[PDB]
């Protein structure tokens, strides 16, 4: 009834530092909510090795089937799976292109880190997740990490000359060191827009521009909230 609501609200309050443990304990508390919780609660991104191509890729609920995850490079599951969820032949071609575009995007903005893009078919369009993970180098005795999770939905139209894009974007930003000091968590923003779909403005360029606009905005809001607002709140305690 109100259980799913209460669970999501509860994850907005429990310390983000223990997201993975708290989500698993939450699902044990209410097992009937497992599927909705795994697809709705953002979790820190994990890195896996695709041994066939010798490339790292990122794990999340969107590339999971059972206990296996799908590589965007080889399009195979690890551990192997015979009955695994797959993009349609045509969408997979678009997924390969998207991975190569956002790998360049990643290099341009993050100058390192790892990226992965997974697409899936919908009845009148498609959806995708764009993932970026970049760890801090540990300088100045501070450990950092940045996780981007961009979920986009594309609703295609009759003209083929216009589509409706819906973007839900989360950045998880993790910082920790006198004594102990841990400043972490995430921000989520949404936006939706119509865009022209053309030979000169294809889906991936439209998505790319929406993600870049959104992530530039979120980087600036993270700066404001983390290092402005929460510091201000601390100083208002004393």
């Amino acid at each position: 009834d109100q259980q799913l609501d209460c669970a999501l609200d509860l994850m907005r309050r429990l310390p983000p530092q223990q997201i993975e443990k708290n989500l698993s304990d939450l699902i044990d508390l209410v097992p009937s909510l497992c599927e909705d919780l795994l697809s709705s609660v953002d979790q820190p991104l994990k890195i896996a090795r695709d041994k066939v191509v010798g490339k790292d890729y990122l794990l999340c609920d969107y590339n999971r089937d059972g206990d296996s995850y799908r590589s965007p490079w080889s399009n195979k599951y690890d551990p192997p799976l015979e009955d695994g969820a797959m993009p349609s032949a045509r969408l997979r071609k678009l997924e390969v292109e998207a991975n190569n575009a956002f790998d360049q995007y990643r290099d341009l903005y993050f100058e390192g880190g790892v990226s992965s893009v997974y697409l899936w078919d919908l009845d009148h369009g498609f959806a995708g997740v764009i993932l970026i993970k970049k760890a801090g180098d540990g300088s100045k005795k501070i450990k950092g990490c940045w996780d981007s999770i961009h979920v986009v939905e594309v609703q295609e139209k009759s003209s083929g000359r216009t589509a409706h894009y819906k973007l839900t974007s989360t950045v998880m930003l993790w910082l920790q060191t006198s004594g102990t000091m841990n400043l972490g968590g995430s921000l989520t923003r949404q936006m939706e827009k119509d865009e022209t779909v053309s030979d000169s403005s294809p889906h991936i360029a439209n998505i790319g521009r929406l993600v870049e606009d959104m992530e530039n905005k979120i980087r600036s809001t993270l700066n404001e909230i983390y290092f402005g607002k929460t510091k201000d709140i601390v100083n208002g305690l004393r």
């Binding site: 497992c34 059972g66 206990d67 819906k166 949404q190």
Partner: peptide, 17 residues
């Protein structure tokens, strides 16, 4: 707000399934 797109019905993790 609005909802994220949902994915096809897939196998749950071995623990809860």
């Amino acid at each position: 707000s609005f909802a994220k797109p949902k994915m096809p019905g897939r196998r749950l993790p071995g623990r809860f399934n």
